[PDB]
Design a protein around this ligand. Structure first.
Ligand code: SF4
Ligand code: SF4
Ligand code: FES
Lengths: 688, 73, 386, 59, 216, 119
């Protein structure tokens, strides 16, 4: 190569840097953290803060390292008297108009401005004049705006324009009277609208739900994962004692970079309401507080009183792999084979992991210049994934959609809306095929709502046909991908949590069980939960399933334990306990093991590591935490092996490929109990 | 109060002159009286009418300081 | 490896906070084994979880007889690693109040020694001047004992107007109070016969036994940290050094009295040389700014926010500094990792070293003299047990 | 310092230095020069005066 | 014994010029040249004695600590007759987690010094009682607070913790409040240690900014 | 002839030699004999039967010397004997053959949401 890595000198240190890198990036590679205010890793170069000024030989003026490209043979100095003089002057110019709001500002303790002033600034001020007074702005109930604190670092504008794609914010006025916000009273319609406060380096933009609640140092930080969807964003949990105070995203380039859905940002409030703390057993007067011994005995009697074919188990959205496998072992050990999943398509065959995962991976998806969407809405299925899709769109990647035309914050081509359009595209009737047939790295992605169709085999067969015709899967590349919207689905698929053929037939003729057990499920259909049937519920929130239940075991929430959760690409991730158990709650797999012992068939494991090892024996990849395997590919042999399922229940060419997600702000009980999501819903309803 | 003399009944505006902290008294200094000013009186320590924390058994309505709501059927 | 066998003599001297076990072949002491730790509060580990400013009050309660001296060593140890210069007026105030603190320590020590010996009048008499100096302390810091006045780079507040007037007024008669104090014991045959030639110590043993303060001076040893390794404005001060050559309890008594005289002389010299100027170091990045400055300036407000929450970050390193305490040489070893909390803060106490001399000194003595040994040792278990 | 508020000229704290000197193995310590600078008579004896105060740097 | 009162007049001076200049500039080099085997590492530090000078610090194996201390007390140029204290520092990151510290004072020449030996939990440290009487209680306290053993000691036993206390509280891994708390029980009529319990648990605050450069 | 010279057996023999004086001085005539006292001391040794460093064993023996010595000078009062010596023996011989038929895992589940810690 023509020396892709050029050489410069920073304070007489030779550092090898890639071509096109900036002096900021070079100094970062040099081990120096230059003060900066407007530059960000994920945004365009703004270069208005003037805080990145450095000294270069043969240059009389300080240069903008946040923007200055590095030339070969360049010399960079960072500790000269002029450097410190410029830094102190810039800090002084920052602080002259800034209001003395630190005691009331919520960013005190984690304010970049404050620390940078402490380090690179002076201690005294010679400004004694009247400051500039700025009125606050309304953007919705999620973000509290104190505009007088704004330093005009323009990060909000760049973020809204590029990542969100809404481009609803701008700079009004001029000079000192330059103003930030919207000229009109507008509500921030961005779904990833909470990232701006984190991106705001000052207290000008603050989380309204978090305002004046607690301080940064009062918190204990626990790195966690997001369970509100199937992407599994890496997050950190901040708490004061047993109470969650705020949840913040953390860096994971291969999953979510530095971004979090506002649904995954503000749903922590629900953990304070409708909480189940004590076991309940339905008496003649109704459900009453009873001991774990009494509840477990009642559950064992109810389970043993019925035949094995009259017991059904259902897994919710937020059940972990450990509890799922424990309950599956429990029900299998008693001759029961009725399994169901709250995430749908519980009867979908799961023999090859690639058939129900994203084989391109999330970061490998960025290598594709052409992307095909088949009946999915990534904006409401995974807004972080939609943001990454937009980032891919920003550098030439074209996207096609087959399904309902919806706002996706970037231009795209609508091929069609029904399976007939997909068949026409596969036949050669549409120009999009030739664009697919000419793309070097084409990509096809299918959502979970397609898997909820009764004709899912036919849709999969058509998709496989199109992939074969366009060569989407070939040597060294796999553009075929399967996504999801719930965490517990992937672990259930990998562990084989699927109903028996006998139970499928029993549903076919209409057999109705009598013992029904819920593992944190609240969005069941009426057909799987007959009325008049005994219900044993395990959960951590009082909701519809809890109300109809007859015996209730207060379980553990994802913020209180460490459960295994694998995202739709097949990467194993685990949560982490940030606060202790609420009330008399117990460990979910411990609860199931206790029930197994009480009934009369003990589970062979007695520890968390033991059940995880049982999972590993069931599927080896469970051991690899925070990694992913390359799934095997079996070409059209799988499709030709599931041809009978295609023959039965033939294709429906009329039903549109829609998204089953109709309420972004409310998908589970925790979302259904969160006050903040309800406030956002009312705000979106008060605009008309 | 000849039988139950107690220093707590001395008003603060005489407390400073009594304690040799200032040379100001009501007879020669006109202080500013807030509208929310509470007068001085005897202590109630040792009695059942004295102050108690909100989690005390003597409180009018006991407080359960659990930071969440329990679900009721 | 060792049995008990012969029980024979057995003694228990006091759970009430010194515990003493002695060994006599009769009326004469042959062995004396103190047991300590009844006041060990584990402060040194506790220091690690506190900021430098947070941990400052810990040093108030190490020697609750002499406080500002305890503050001064830790403050100097911080500042030397911080490379901070102290203003002149602050040094004057520090030296003057340190002399007053030394006077208090000497007064209380001598009075307690007398009461243990059997004289009760000087106890009560000197506690009146002790109350006067407590009033002085309260006027300047709002606390009678635990002032927390000394600060990194100076002091918390300047002296209130009219204080030096009363200081001079007190000094105008403190000499008379000391004179009337002496006549009760100085010319007494009983006080001498109780104190003369009891607990004799040599220079060689003392330097072997790590003595400091007045005990060292009574062995014919020319040593004052204020004259050999001066700190702050002590180099400018001119005063004498009492010297004795017997190592006797009476000698230590006279040495402490003459030390009080010299302290009064230094108090006078400080009173007539008080300068006008700044009392805190002008580095706001370490020293807190004025409240008026804080409430009208963004930068001082930010520094007040940061220092009062996180505090200044001492550069990584190590140092040990000592101060000529009234009970000896009080030193603190500071270990810095670079953060806003001291990594390891070891505290050296002179009384702890002096307390180690009991067994060898009490040999050949009588039970009437153990109390004499303890009283003349001038030991506070707060510094001994940290 | 009321109007001249520059700090780098007076940041003693963050400007101290430690250096790892060379390996002090093949050095020549001439004690002759050490003892040649010492007095030999009652006179010619010089003593370092006790400093009056610690540095103040103008304040 | 030294530092005897010789002059009847006031002294306006500290030490002699040549001796002070040597002790402040070439003392470390003299130590290095004299006993290089006893020397392992050299640091000249912030001058414990005074804020305006330099003073050395000594690192060596525990093997030669005793002869090194003997020379440092007994050498005609280094009359360090006062051993201030013996303590230790915990370095859990290192293979040897303990840095025992030795401080000396030389009233003969108004100087001071620091001596350090780095050891682990299972290596003996020869006692300095034969060199200094005061080392007895300092070794006792160091053992009580860290478990640093001292071979050949007359009687090495705890001096500051509880009578039945096991463990060394100044260790970095040792909990701030510990494991056991003690209370009196009416039923047994005895004061008994019980598992530690707190009405309000301790609050730890993270103030350390992500921008500070001095962190080491 | 024995592992690490068998210093452990010498330490146990020394403590057993010193044992009866403790029983007489601390009025354990009406609670224990020499035999079960020796059994208590033996069970104390079993806590570290699997240590593989002679140095660690030496330091264990030294700390045990300190414990037995502070036992010898009566520095630990009768309450220490109550809380560590004879009541633990009474509990050990008292809760023998308990009537609970549940597994320890189920016992922990019926106990609390966390395992018990400390004595
Ligand atoms: S943004 Fe930072 S500097 Fe500005 S008022 Fe808030 S805490 Fe203070
Ligand atoms: S509001 Fe915040 S993000 Fe926007 S320009 Fe101002 S400081 Fe930057
Ligand atoms: S980052 Fe360089 S001026 Fe903004």
């Amino acid at each position: 190569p023509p020396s892709d890595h050029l050489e410069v000198f920073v304070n007489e240190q030779p550092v090898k840097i890639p071509k096109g890198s900036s002096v900021l990036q070079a100094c970062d590679a040099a081990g120096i953290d230059i003060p900066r205010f407007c530059y960000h890793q994920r945004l365009s170069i703004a270069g208005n803060c003037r805080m990145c000024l450095v000294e270069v030989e043969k240059v009389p003026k300080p240069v903008a390292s946040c923007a200055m490209p590095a030339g070969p043979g360049m010399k960079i100095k960072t500790e000269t008297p002029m450097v410190k003089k410029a830094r102190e002057g810039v800090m002084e110019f920052l602080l002259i108009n800034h209001p003395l709001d630190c005691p009331i500002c919520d960013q005190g303790g984690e304010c970049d401005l404050q620390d940078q002033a402490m380090i690179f600034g002076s201690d005294r001020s010679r400004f004694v004049e009247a400051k500039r007074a700025v009125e606050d702005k309304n953007l919705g109930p999620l973000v509290k705006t104190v505009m007088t604190r704004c330093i005009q670092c323009t990060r909000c504008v760049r973020f809204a324009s590029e990542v969100a794609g809404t481009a609803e914010l701008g700079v009004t006025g001029r000079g000192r009277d330059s103003e930030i916000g919207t000229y009109v009273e507008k509500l921030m319609g961005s779904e990833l609208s909470g990232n701006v406060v984190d991106l705001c380096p000052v207290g000008a933009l603050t989380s309204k739900p978090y305002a004046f609640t607690a301080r940064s140092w009062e918190l204990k930080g626990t790195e966690s994962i997001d369970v509100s969807d199937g992407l599994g964003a890496n997050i950190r949990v901040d708490a004061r004692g047993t109470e969650v105070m705020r949840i913040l995203p953390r860096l994971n380039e291969a999953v979510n970079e530095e971004w979090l859905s506002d649904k995954g940002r503000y749903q922590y409030d629900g953990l304070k309401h409708q909480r189940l703390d004590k076991p309940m057993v339905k008496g003649p007067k109704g459900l009453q507080v009873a001991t774990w011994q009494d509840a477990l005995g009642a559950a064992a009697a109810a389970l043993t009183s019925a035949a094995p074919g009259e017991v059904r188990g259902i897994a919710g959205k937020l059940a972990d792999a450990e509890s799922m496998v424990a309950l599956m072992d429990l029900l299998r050990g008693l001759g029961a084979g009725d399994l169901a999943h709250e995430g749908g398509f519980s009867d979908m065959p799961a023999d090859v992991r690639s058939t129900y995962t994203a084989n391109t991976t999330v970061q490998g998806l960025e290598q594709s210049d052409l992307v095909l969407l088949v009946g999915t809405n990534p904006r409401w299925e995974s807004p972080v994934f939609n943001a990454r899709l937009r980032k891919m769109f920003l550098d030439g990647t074209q996207v096609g959609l087959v399904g309902a035309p919806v706002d996706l914050t970037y231009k795209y081509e609508h091929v069609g809306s029904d399976p007939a359009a997909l068949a026409a595209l596969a036949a050669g009737q549409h120009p999009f095929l030739e664009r697919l047939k000419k793309a070097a790295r084409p990509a096809v992605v299918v959502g979970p709502g397609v898997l909820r169709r009764a004709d899912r085999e036919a849709v999969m067969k058509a998709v496989h046909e199109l992939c074969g015709k366009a060569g989407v899967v070939k040597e060294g590349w796999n553009g075929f991908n399967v996504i999801h919207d719930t965490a517990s689905r992937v672990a259930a698929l990998d562990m084989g949590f699927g109903p028996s053929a006998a139970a499928r037939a029993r549903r076919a003729q209409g057999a109705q069980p009598k013992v029904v057990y819920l593992l944190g499920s609240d969005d069941y259909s009426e057909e799987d939960v007959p009325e008049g049937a005994f219900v044993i519920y395990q959960g951590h929130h009082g909701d519809r399933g809890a109300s109809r239940a007859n015996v209730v075991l207060p379980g553990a929430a994802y913020t209180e334990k460490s459960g295994l959760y694998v995202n739709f690409e097949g990467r194993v991730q685990q949560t982490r306990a940030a606060v202790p158990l609420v009330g008399d709650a117990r460990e979910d797999w411990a609860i199931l093991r206790a029930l197994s012992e009480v009934v009369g068939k003990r589970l062979p494991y007695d520890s968390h590591a033991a059940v995880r090892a049982r999972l590993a024996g069931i599927a080896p990849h469970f051991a690899n935490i925070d990694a992913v395997q390359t799934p095997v590919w079996l070409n059209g042999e799988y499709v030709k092996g599931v041809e009978a399922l295609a023959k039965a229940a033939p294709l429906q060419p009329s039903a549109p490929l829609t998204s089953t997600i109709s309420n972004f702000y409310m998908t589970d009980a925790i979302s259904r109990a969160s006050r903040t999501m309800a406030k956002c819903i009312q705000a979106r309803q008060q605009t008309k | 109060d000849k039988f139950d003399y107690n220093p707590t009944t001395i008003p603060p505006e005489w407390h400073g002159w009594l304690n040799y902290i200032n040379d100001y008294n009501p007879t020669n200094t006109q202080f500013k009286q807030p509208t929310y000013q509470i007068e001085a009186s005897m202590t109630k320590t040792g009695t059942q009418t004295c102050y108690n924390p909100k989690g005390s058994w003597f409180s009018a309505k006991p407080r359960n300081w659990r930071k969440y709501e329990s679900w009721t059927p | 490896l060792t049995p008990a066998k012969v029980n024979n003599f057995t003694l228990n001297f006091g759970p009430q906070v010194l515990r003493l076990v002695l060994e006599m072949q009769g009326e004469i002491i042959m062995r004396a084994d103190p047991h300590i730790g009844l006041l060990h509060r584990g402060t040194e580990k506790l220091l690690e979880y506190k900021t430098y400013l947070q941990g400052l009050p810990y040093f108030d309660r190490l020697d609750y007889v002499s406080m500002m001296c305890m503050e001064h060593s830790y403050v100097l140890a911080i500042e030397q690693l911080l490379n901070v210069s102290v203003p002149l007026r602050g040094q004057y105030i520090r030296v003057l109040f340190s002399e007053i603190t030394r006077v208090l320590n000497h007064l209380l020590a001598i009075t307690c020694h007398s009461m243990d010996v059997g004289a009760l009048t000087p106890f009560l008499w000197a506690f009146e001047e002790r109350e006067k100096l407590f009033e002085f302390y309260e006027r300047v810091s709002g606390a009678r004992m635990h002032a927390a006045y000394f600060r990194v780079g100076g002091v918390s507040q300047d002296l209130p107007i009219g204080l030096l007037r009363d200081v001079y007024d007190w000094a105008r008669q403190f000499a008379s109070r000391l004179d009337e104090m002496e006549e009760l014991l100085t010319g007494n045959r009983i006080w001498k016969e109780r104190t003369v030639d009891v607990g004799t110590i040599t220079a060689q043993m003392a330097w072997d036994w790590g003595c400091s303060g007045p005990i060292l001076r009574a062995s014919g040893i020319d040593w004052d940290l204020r004259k050999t390794q001066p700190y702050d404005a002590y180099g400018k001060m001119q005063f004498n050094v009492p010297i004795a050559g017997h190592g006797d309890c009476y000698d230590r008594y006279l040495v402490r009295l003459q030390e009080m005289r010299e302290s009064l002389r230094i108090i006078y010299q400080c009173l007539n040389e008080m300068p006008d100027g700044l009392y805190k170091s002008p580095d706001g990045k370490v020293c807190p700014p004025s409240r008026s400055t804080m409430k009208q300036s963004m930068e001082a407000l930010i520094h007040h926010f940061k220092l009062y929450t996180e505090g200044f970050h001492v550069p990584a390193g190590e140092t040990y500094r000592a101060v000529e305490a009234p009970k000896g040489e009080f030193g603190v070893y500071l270990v810095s990792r670079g953060g806003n909390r001291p990594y390891r803060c070891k505290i050296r106490s002179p009384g702890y070293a002096h307390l180690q001399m009991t067994d060898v000194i009490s040999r050949g003595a009588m039970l009437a003299d153990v109390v004499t040994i303890i009283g003349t040792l001038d030991v506070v278990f707060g510094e001994i047990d940290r | 310092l009321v109007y001249d508020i520059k700090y780098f000229v007076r940041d003693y704290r963050r400007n101290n230095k430690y250096t790892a000197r060379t390996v002090d193995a093949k050095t020549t310590f001439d004690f002759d020069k050490l003892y040649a600078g010492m007095p030999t008579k009652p006179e010619q004896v010089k003593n370092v005066t006790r400093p009056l105060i610690m540095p103040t740097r103008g304040y | 014994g030294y530092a005897y009162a010789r002059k009847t007049t006031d002294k306006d001076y500290i030490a002699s010029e040549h001796m002070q200049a040597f002790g402040n500039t070439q003392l470390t080099d003299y130590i290095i040249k004299t006993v290089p085997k006893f020397v392992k590492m050299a640091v000249t530090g912030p001058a414990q004695s005074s804020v305006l000078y330099q003073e050395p610090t000594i690192y060596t194996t525990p093997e030669s600590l005793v002869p090194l201390m003997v020379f440092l007390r007994d050498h005609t140029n280094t009359q360090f007759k006062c051993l201030l204290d013996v303590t230790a520092v915990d370095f859990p990151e290192r293979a040897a987690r303990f840095e025992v510290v030795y401080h000396l004072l030389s009233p003969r020449w108004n100087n001071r010094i620091r001596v350090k030996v780095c050891v682990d939990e299972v290596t003996a440290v020869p006692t300095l009682c034969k060199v200094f009487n005061t080392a007895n209680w300092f070794e006792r306290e160091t053992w009580d607070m860290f478990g640093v053993f001292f071979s050949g000691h007359p009687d090495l036993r705890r001096i500051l913790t509880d009578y039945g206390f096991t463990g060394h509280p100044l260790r970095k891994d040792f909990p701030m409040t510990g494991y056991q708390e003690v209370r009196y029980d009416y039923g047994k009529k005895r004061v008994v240690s019980e598992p530690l319990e707190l009405t309000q648990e301790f609050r730890y605050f993270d103030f350390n900014s992500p921008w500070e450069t001095l962190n080491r | 002839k024995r592992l690490f010279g068998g210093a452990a057996r010498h330490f146990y023999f020394e403590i057993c030699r010193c044992l009866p004086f403790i029983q007489r001085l601390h009025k354990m005539e009406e609670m224990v004999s020499l035999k079960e006292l020796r059994a208590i001391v033996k069970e104390k040794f079993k806590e570290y039967k699997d240590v593989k460093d002679g140095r660690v064993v030496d330091l264990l023996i030294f700390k045990g010397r300190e414990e037995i010595e502070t036992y010898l000078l009566m520095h630990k009062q009768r309450h220490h004997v109550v809380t560590e010596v004879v009541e633990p023996y009474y509990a050990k011989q008292r809760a023998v053959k308990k009537v609970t038929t549940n597994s320890p895992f189920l016992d922990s589940f019926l106990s609390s949401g966390y395992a018990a810690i400390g004595v």
